[PDB]
Design a protein around this ligand. Sequence first.
Ligand SMILES: O=C(O)Cc1cc(I)c(Oc2ccc(O)c(I)c2)c(I)c1
Length: 264
Amino acid sequence: GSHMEEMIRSLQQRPEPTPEEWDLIHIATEAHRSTNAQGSHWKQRRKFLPDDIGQSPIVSMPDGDKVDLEAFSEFTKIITPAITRVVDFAKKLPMFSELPCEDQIILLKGCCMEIMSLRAAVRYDPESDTLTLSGEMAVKREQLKNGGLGVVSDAIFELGKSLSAFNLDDTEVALLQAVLLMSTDRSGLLCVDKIEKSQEAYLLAFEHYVNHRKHNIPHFWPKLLMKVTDLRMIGACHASRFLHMKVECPTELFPPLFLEVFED
Ligand SMILES: O=C(O)Cc1cc(I)c(Oc2ccc(O)c(I)c2)c(I)c1
């Protein structure tokens, strides 16, 4: 192109975001930052879930990983704000908020656990080997496992540990969320084509933003896509396990919003 353009683009050749993609990137990034509990100040003012909690699984589950009701209660007491923040994030993306209300509900139920799991995973702390839930509650593998998640907890920790080396920034987390949200692998959607077109726009903007960032680890983009796949598997194991939870435990132990999201 122009001399200046060429000068500016010398150390690049992989496609950068277009100006339209930068707009999309900026809105998603801000939507995430404004809905992500604690402004990058999470590790300072976080508290550990007491070591004596989450050591006593005694409610049976079909897969044999039992549940500690006390730990389950501690986790579910803070889950309502966590789900609400995912909803707030989604409502801030124009391509989501212009969908029929019914499609918005289906998309949210479809991705809620995928996004929450990703938000917990990016707060993995290698030193203490904990996840920080909602940026306030540091939990150990055993505690999160026994408090209801079973093997889903091991999957989240594994993801969190592997994501450490990716050094994701807010934009990359935000775009993963948008890609998870705008999925047509749900049933009963009306605006299938429009949702797909939106996902494709986010995916391309995401690939181009990845080029822009020039991460030091190789094969970054396909590596990141593989993490999207892991997150969707985490979502599915959670949906399966939630069904069993509901068979074993009375409704009064589940906050209303938690039941609503993970319904069918
Ligand atoms: O980290 C925050 O932003 C969000 C965060 C908050 C919660 I509480 C959550 O922990 C869960 C999730 C599902 C579940 O059935 C049980 I029992 C515990 C996840 I993992 C992530």
